[PDB]
Homo-oligomer: A and B are copies of this chain.
């Protein structure tokens, strides 16, 4: 059924750029949309302004979008729930404020769309896996793909993938998240793990991309960082039990390539500084997603015994003061090799 599905209400927990862009998308398929944001006072300012001046400045919100500081009201009546809360606050939220919400989701069986990306430091678990400790897996899907928020927010042509172990849940969410004007196009996949691994690794890789830029390298080098980096995503995915079908799709390759080329992104600028020789502190004197993700990624890789050449040097450069040029050299120390890609066709 390529027939879209329209709803009465949707709520988005998480008011940053992407969550807000996604509200914009939903505002066209849902009569009403709420966006949960902890500070009431902020909830005010924003609703007055008709624009999220905190995280999505310049975009005027659709009239059917309303910010609220009240969890219960926020989800009350929602027929789709999206989580965009940062990884680090994710578990806390369910602990302290999601008891009723969970009960609802479960009672009413409301489909949940995980849009949060990262690795929790304490358990080395990804977002949907943490949510899955609270909500049943069948209600769980993941949204991932090349989707800069501003463009998604302004309705500029965007494609994403939606993943669920049960392809059928993914297909339904597909009918809800996809727009009537074909400006937000969803593709179904079963690979949740691949999507989450890619979503998190890409940030780490993006710092490598800036590193390469700050070291004097050019576009050929970025293209190779993306190609070789992807195999690291592929390998960590296998180790975590993913089926890997998203690696080479929009959520893996597609998003990685977009994220590694976002020159003005913080991951990129931080990597460029480091590449230009600036030390982290000084660079430090918000956190780049790749900086925060690098350490838990590395602990996870070590635990699973997964080598991730680029991620590893990126972690050493970020964490252990490694000179970038030395890191490049160590990286280049492997010798001559075969590409490392299996045939597709026998």
Contacts and interface: CB of A to CB of B under 8 A. Distances in A.
Interface in A283-337: 329, 332, 335-337
B212 A157 contact: yes
Given A156-B216, A219-B258, A220-B258, 13 more contacts: A2-B335, A2-B336, A145-B220, A157-B217, A159-B223, A167-B338, A187-B337, A189-B341, A190-B343, A223-B257, A237-B345, A244-B345, A253-B253
Interface string A232-244: 0010011000111
A103 interface: no
Contact of A224 (B234, B248, B254): B254
A226 B248 CA distance: 11
Interface string A170-207: 01001100100010011111110000000000000000
A99 interface: no
A332 B249 contact: no
A245 interface: yes
Interface in A243-272: 243-250, 253-255, 257-258, 261-262
A151 to B, nearest CB: 5
A249 B226 CA distance: 10
A227 interface: yes
Given A156-B217, A344-B234, A336 B254 contact: no
A218 interface: yes
A107 interface: no
A169 B258 CA distance: 35
A191 B342 CA distance: 10
A109 interface: no
Nearest to A191: B343
Contacts of A218: 148, 151, 156-157
B339 A220 contact: no
Nearest to A188: B338
Given A246-B341, A339-B249, A221 B191 contact: no
A158 interface: yes
A71 B275 CA distance: 46
Contact of A158 (B158, B224, B244): B224
Contact of A245 (B2, B147, B262, B342): B342
Contacts of A254: 223-224, 226-227
Nearest to A171: B336
Contacts of A246: 339, 341
B221 A250 contact: no
Interface in A141-171: 145-148, 151-152, 156-159, 161, 167, 171
B188 A245 contact: no
A190 B346 CA distance: 12
Interface in A7-25: none
